[PDB]
């Protein structure tokens, strides 16, 4: 609906390790979405446990957390119309085996446990994830010079 | 698509030109094996755009569609090849970029249907109409690709 | 129980070589995380092409296929990784380019099914057969990717 | 010395070998990405008399007839690009006229080998650009528009 | 000399506006340099005036600072052997008219006042710029899986 | 510059180039320029072959370490054919030490350390002939004619 919808996109440690920071940003940049926040971080274990709190009672929870601590993460907020859903489409199917070539995982990933990136799955979860990963002042307010060539209305 | 000399009309809309997408869009058709047989940068008169959109003259959005397409230059092209009409639309992606797949032009570069960066003829008959409308007959260039027999089974 | 050491046979056909597509096709598999184990430029003898296409020997226009595949060099490759046979086919795209999707090799580069730029094995068992047909065993290079553990969670 | 006027224009042509080898998109992208503005473009198979006029300075050379004949042998993507110093910087983007002397990263240093198959042409001076633009294009084929990012490409007008 | 030399690379507001974040990051990433800090920032005028302290007495100073306030900046620390000098080579000549195609400015820029990016000009100026633009905890310690294939050791 | 369009050179992608996923990009640089691939294989050659490859450097203190390093992974061995391909090939690779190389070349885009400089290219027409014959069996050189030869070359 509105062109100021926001989503959280993270490049996971394997994405950073395999040199995919540049290509992943370009996918979102070229599509017309606006980068409003970005930082390279090695977040503390508590933040990762809170991020994955829905999986806390799962037997893989401990190893998943320790894996996400194993290298830096490129955390980002992207803004645009339907950016949450279209963002997931750009990333491709969560399991790369189900993903389509032309998407990030369909071009770059194989294992679901090494699926290079994450994107919020809903507007509500995006708001939660943005608040968990960013301070409010880390979101930069700006307007793209080509806004009116990307969008027909607000 | 039966005959390898089928032709379609592809236009890069004002937003495609403004956002610097001329090169990338041409490369998509070039790399696929289609042959560019006509091209010009043009800002056509309102009467021509109204005739282009003649099948929509009885739609409420008709005037704003015409007025938007007057708001910047258009890269008008004729591409030739087997099934180029239908395959060309597949290359452009779904008319509404929200329904398009990454790896297509609109799936890589566009968000709003009113800013969907390009147009392609929707049928062989409409292609011939659009080609006759946008190009004089002598602007279609007759030539044979050096790799014709490697693109097409003889 | 798909193991990360599965192998498939990918070949760039004479039209792919002629049209300058060796680099981009290799990049598609390289970027995905699959490991190149074997590769060679080759113009194989007619008898090897006929054995490669054994399933088509009693179908029409068999001679025409073999002649066309003799008409230029082929870039023969072995790629290794988890589910590489099935995923490799998805990367190539639908065998008939008219049915393929942009973002695949054929959806980006090809038009005619008879000039569809590349080949990939259609099954694990046929890949093993094709790998043994096109490569001597010493031509398969055993190595370990520096990013193996960033591509794979398990073996 | 570089030009200082943002409305300078140059004539860029993709030659029949550049069209034949599938380099239209890549070549346009080099100028597009640099920030130059496309103000005219057409695919054209010009008459022999126009090519002879384009190469008028070489009319007495022994290779003239074969050069003209070669430039007739396939389509040409004719362009006018506009921007600050676009004549001289455009030639820098094309690379040395002889590709053997060109640098990788330029069009000829990425795509060409023989000077007689050097994929493209660019005007060699501001005055020759003005002449070439008028030779290859009708005046109404130059398109007036304003790039949305003009003020992020240029500090001054 | 040392493979842990660091330099400050900034994508200026024009580079952000023109959609060049991805390509610029890719140039450094593909070369083998390691990203150790990155943030998108709209830094305060005080920080920009410090960054340009040496030009404070120039006529263009006020407009220069105002321009660098006009859009976000992608601020980065890159690490690797000779990354300061080699980083400047990757960016191209500071004036894009003097830059070579194949560099960032030679591929994407025309005006020196709209030259898309900045890179430290010396190791000592890099240490100064990193301290000014980054907090120390924003620099992340990690080791590339391909370190031993980029570097002999 | 050479003037014979059938000149050949030996180009190798070193173990670090293979490890870092640069096979595709490096081949494309030569492919896009108009050079013709006439031989290619992935190989892990024996020490004796590498010592013969580097015979002109066998009096240098880095010789044994250079040989050992070239055994540390697979090598993509290639022969490319075209006018001035030896000298223009080296120009495409960039300066041997990437510190001195220019962006837009292979080493200027992808490499930092001279000991991890991604690739090798023959330094002379004669050394190309020797290297080609050292790395390939005679029958691994493939005879074919590029469909765009007459659009890459004006004559000869």
Q: Give every strand in the sheet of E34-41, ordered side by side.
A: A117-119, A6-11, A73-79, A34-41, E34-41, E73-79, E6-11, E117-119
C-alpha span between E97 and C153 (Å, rounded):
48
Nearest to A135 by CA among E140, E34, E138, E141: E138
Chain C neighbours (≥3 Cβ pairs under 8 A) are A, B, E, F
Task: Answer yes or no: do C27 and F31 touch at CB < 8 A.
Answer: no
C-alpha span between C123 and C84 (Å, rounded):
10
Cα C142 to the center of its chain, rounded Å: 19
Q: Exposed, middle or buried: residue D98 (CB in 10 Å: 0-12, 13-18, 19+)? A: middle
Catalytic residues of E: 118
Cα F15 to the center of its chain, rounded Å: 13
Contact D6, D84 (CB under 8 A): yes
C-alpha span between D114 and F2 (Å, rounded):
11
Give percent helix, percent strand, percent coil of chain F, each to the nearest 5: 45, 15, 35
Q: Which residues pair with D13 in a beta bridge?
A: D78, D121
Q: Under 8 Å CB-to-CB from B14, ≥6 apart: which residues?
A: A149, B68, B69, B71, B72, B73, B74
C-alpha span between A116 and A87 (Å, rounded):
14
Of the candidates C33, C152, C154, which has its C-beta nearest A108's C-beta? C33
Q: Which residues pair with C71 in a beta bridge?
A: none
Secondary structure letter of residue A58 according to DSSP: S
Contact B15, B72 (CB under 8 A): yes
Q: Exposed, middle or buried: residue E44 (CB in 10 Å: 0-12, 13-18, 19+)? A: exposed
Name the catalytic one among C119, C120, C127, C134.
C119
C-alpha span between A40 and E76 (Å, rounded):
9
Task: Answer yes or no: do B32 and C112 touch at CB < 8 A.
Answer: no
C-alpha span between D128 and D140 (Å, rounded):
20
Secondary structure letter of residue A32 according to DSSP: T
Helices D24-34, D86-94: inter-axial angle, 10-degree rounding: 140
Q: Cα separations (Å) of F106 from C143, F20, F26, F111?
A: 24, 13, 7, 8
C-alpha span between C120 and C117 (Å, rounded):
11
- Cα-atom radius of gyration of chain B, to the nearest Å? 15
- Token pair for D14: 């993709």
Contact C31, C149 (CB under 8 A): no
Residue E60 in marked binding region:
yes
E strands, A21-153, in order: 34-41, 73-79, 117-119
Angle at D9 between CA D7 and CA D12, to 5 degrees: 150
**Breaks in chain D listed by the residue before each, with C–N > 2.5 Å:** none
C142 interfaces chain A, CB cutoff of 8 Å: no
Q: Which residues pair with C78 in a beta bridge?
A: C9, C38
Instruction: Quickly tell me which residue has 């998407």 as its tokens.
Output: A103
Nearest to F2 by CA among F107, F82, F76: F82
Contact C43, C85 (CB under 8 A): no
Residue E94 in marked binding region:
yes
C-alpha span between E80 and E67 (Å, rounded):
31
E31 interfaces chain A, CB cutoff of 8 Å: no
Task: Answer yes or no: do F152 and D103 touch at CB < 8 A.
Answer: no
Q: Which residue in chain C is spatially nearest to E147 when comparing CA positions? A: C146
Nearest to A6 by CA among A145, A136, A153: A136
Q: Which residues of D touch E101 (CB under 8 A)?
A: 30, 92-93, 95, 103, 105-106, 109
C-alpha span between E77 and E34 (Å, rounded):
8
Nearest to F103 by CA among D87, E24, B20, D21: E24
Chain F neighbours (≥3 Cβ pairs under 8 A) are B, C, D, E
Helices D24-34, B22-32: inter-axial angle, 10-degree rounding: 160
B91 interfaces chain C, CB cutoff of 8 Å: yes
Q: Which residue in chain C is spatially nearest to A104 when comparing CA positions? A: C32
Secondary structure letter of residue C141 according to DSSP: P
Q: Give every strand in the sheet of F119-121, ordered side by side.
A: C118-120, C7-12, C74-80, C35-42, F36-43, F75-81, F8-13, F119-121
Work out the minimum CA distance from A146 to partner chain D, whole angstroms.
6
D66 interfaces chain F, CB cutoff of 8 Å: no
Q: Which residues pair with C76 in a beta bridge?
A: C11, C40
C-alpha span between C133 and C126 (Å, rounded):
10
Secondary structure letter of residue F83 according to DSSP: T
Instruction: Quickly tell me which residue has 């330029």 as its tokens.
Output: D106
Cα C65 to the center of its chain, rounded Å: 17
Work out the minimum CA distance from E58 to partner chain F, whole angstroms.
33
A136 interfaces chain B, CB cutoff of 8 Å: no
Q: Under 8 Å CB-to-CB from E121, ≥6 apart: which residues?
A: E84, E88
Name the catalytic one among A78, A118, A130, A134.
A118
Q: Which residue in chain B is spatially nearest to D145 when comparing CA positions? A: B72
Work out the minimum CA distance from F148 to partner chain B, whole angstroms.
6
Q: Which residue in chain B is spatially nearest to D78 when comparing CA positions? A: B40
Contact F75, F101 (CB under 8 A): no
C-alpha span between B74 and D28 (Å, rounded):
15
Count of alpha carbons within 13 angstroms of residue D142, beta-carbon side: 17
Nearest to D20 by CA among D122, D132, D135, D120: D120
For chain C, where are the alpha helices, taking DSSP H only?
14-18, 22-32, 46-52, 62-69, 84-92, 105-109, 124-134, 148-151
3-state secondary structure of C78: strand
Cα D112 to the center of its chain, rounded Å: 15
- Chains C–E, number of C-beta pairs less than 8 Å apart: 8
Q: Cα separations (Å) of F57 from B121, F45, F50, F79, F114?
A: 63, 18, 11, 22, 15
**Annotated binding site for ATP: which residue ranges of F?**
14, 62, 90, 96, 107, 117
Q: Cα separations (Å) of D126 from C154, D3, D84, D90?
A: 63, 9, 11, 11
Nearest to E96 by CA among E8, E14, E7, E32: E14
- Token pair for C79: 């790629």
Q: Exposed, middle or buried: residue D69 (CB in 10 Å: 0-12, 13-18, 19+)? A: exposed
C-alpha span between B105 and A98 (Å, rounded):
22
Q: Resolution in angstroms, to 1 decimal, for this deposition?
A: 2.0
Work out the minimum CA distance from C112 to partner chain B, whole angstroms.
6
3-state secondary structure of B7: strand
C-alpha span between E24 and A4 (Å, rounded):
26
Q: What are phi and psi of D149, to 5 degrees?
A: -105, 20
Secondary structure letter of residue D76 according to DSSP: E
Q: What are phi and psi of B122, to 5 degrees?
A: -95, -5
Best probe of the D interface among A29, A143, A146, by most D CBs < 10 A, is A146
Q: Which residues pair with D145 in a beta bridge?
A: none
C-alpha span between E93 and B4 (Å, rounded):
48
Residue count of chain D, please give it. 157
Q: Cα separations (Å) of D150 from A46, B87, C61, E63, F96?
A: 46, 35, 59, 18, 40
Nearest to D7 by CA among D35, D29, D37, D27: D37
Name the catalytic one among F9, F120, F135, F136.
F120
C-alpha span between E20 and A27 (Å, rounded):
12
Work out the minimum CA distance from C135 to partner chain A, whole angstroms.
26
Work out the minimum CA distance from F93 to partner chain B, whole angstroms.
25
C-alpha span between E68 and C70 (Å, rounded):
61
- Token pair for A110: 């194989």
**Annotated binding site for ATP: which residue ranges of C?**
13, 61, 89, 95, 106, 116
Q: Which residues pair with D81 in a beta bridge?
A: D10, D38
B31 interfaces chain F, CB cutoff of 8 Å: no
C-alpha span between B100 and D146 (Å, rounded):
29
C-alpha span between F105 and D82 (Å, rounded):
28
3-state secondary structure of D153: helix
For chain D, where are the alpha helices, taking DSSP H only?
16-20, 24-34, 48-54, 64-71, 86-94, 107-111, 126-136, 150-153
Give percent helix, percent strand, percent coil of chain E, each to the nearest 5: 50, 15, 35
Three-state secondary structure of chain E: CCCCCEEEEEECHHHHHCCCHHHHHHHHHHHCCEEEEEEEECCCHHHHHHHCHHHCCCCCHHHHHHHHHCCCEEEEEEECCCHHHHHHHHHCCCCHHHCCECEHHHHHCCCHHHCCEEECCCHHHHHHHHHHHCCHHHCCCCCCCCHHHHCCC
Q: Quick one: residue C103, left, alpha or beta (phi over 0 = left, psi -120 to 50 = alpha)? A: left
Instruction: Quickly tell me which residue has 């009096």 as its tokens.
Output: F59
Handedness of CA C61, C67, C72, C73 (dihedral sign): positive
Q: Cα separations (Å) of E86 from A23, A97, A151, C69?
A: 22, 39, 40, 47
Nearest to A120 by CA among A84, A86, A75: A84
C-alpha span between E124 and B68 (Å, rounded):
53
Rounded to 10 degrees, the C-alpha dihedral B54/B56/B60/B63 comes to -40
C-alpha span between D117 and A15 (Å, rounded):
42
Q: Which 69-88 residues of chain E touch chain F by CB within 8 A?
A: 80-82, 86
- Token pair for F17: 């180039």
3-state secondary structure of C38: strand
Where are chain A's structural domains? 1-154
**Annotated binding site: which residue ranges of C?**
13, 61, 89, 95, 106, 116
C-alpha span between E11 and A92 (Å, rounded):
28
Q: Exposed, middle or buried: residue F123 (CB in 10 Å: 0-12, 13-18, 19+)? A: middle
C-alpha span between C98 and C80 (Å, rounded):
28
Angle at D87 between CA D24 and CA B17, to 5 degrees: 45
Q: Cα separations (Å) of D71 from B38, C85, D15, D55?
A: 18, 47, 7, 10
In chain E, what is the greatest distance between 2 CA atoms, to the nearest angstrom?
Answer: 49
Best probe of the A interface among D32, D35, D149, D151, by most A CBs < 10 A, is D149
To the query of whether residue A51 is one of the catalytic residues in this protein, the response is no
Task: Answer yes or no: do C109 and B31 touch at CB < 8 A.
Answer: yes
Q: Exposed, middle or buried: residue E135 (CB in 10 Å: 0-12, 13-18, 19+)? A: exposed
Q: Exposed, middle or buried: residue D109 (CB in 10 Å: 0-12, 13-18, 19+)? A: buried
Count of alpha carbons within 13 angstroms of residue F126, beta-carbon side: 1
Nearest to C132 by CA among C85, C76, C89, C72: C76
User: How many CB atoms neighbour CB D149 within 10 A?
Assistant: 21
C-alpha span between C10 and D39 (Å, rounded):
45
Secondary structure letter of residue A68 according to DSSP: H
Contact F14, F118 (CB under 8 A): yes
Contact E151, E81 (CB under 8 A): yes
C-alpha span between A122 and A82 (Å, rounded):
10
Chain D neighbours (≥3 Cβ pairs under 8 A) are A, B, E, F
Element (H, E) at F129: helix F125-135
Residue A94 in marked binding region:
yes
C-alpha span between F135 and B102 (Å, rounded):
42
Nearest to A101 by CA among C29, E83, F141, F44: C29
With b for 16 or more beta-carbon neighbours within 10 A and e for fewer, the B4-39 pattern comes to bebbbbbbbbbbbbbbbbbbbbbbbbbbbbbbbbbb
Task: Answer yes or no: do D106 and F104 touch at CB < 8 A.
Answer: yes
Contact A48, A65 (CB under 8 A): yes
3-state secondary structure of A86: helix
Three-state secondary structure of B108-148: HHCCCHHHCCEEECCCHHHHHHHHHHHCCHHHCCCCCCCCH
C-alpha span between E131 and B43 (Å, rounded):
52
């Amino acid at each position: 609906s509105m062109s100021n919808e926001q989503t959280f996109i993270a490049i996971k440690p394997d994405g950073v390790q395999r040199g995919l920071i540049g290509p992943i940003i370009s996918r979102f940049e070229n599509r017309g979405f606006k980068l409003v926040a970005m930082k390279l971080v090695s977040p503390p274990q508590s933040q990762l446990e809170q991020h994955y709190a829905d999986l806390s009672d799962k037997p893989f929870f401990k190893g998943l957390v320790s894996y996400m601590l194993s290298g830096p993460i490129c955390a980002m907020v992207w803004e645009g119309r339907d950016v949450v859903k279209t963002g997931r489409t750009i990333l491709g199917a969560t399991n790369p085996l189900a993903s389509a070539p032309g998407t990030i995982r369909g071009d770059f990933a194989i294992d679901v446990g090494r699926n290079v990136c994450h994107g919020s799955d809903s507007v509500e979860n995006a708001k939660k994830e943005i608040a968990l990963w960013f301070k409010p002042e880390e979101l930069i307010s700006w307007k793209s010079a080509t806004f009116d060539w990307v969008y027909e209305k607000a």
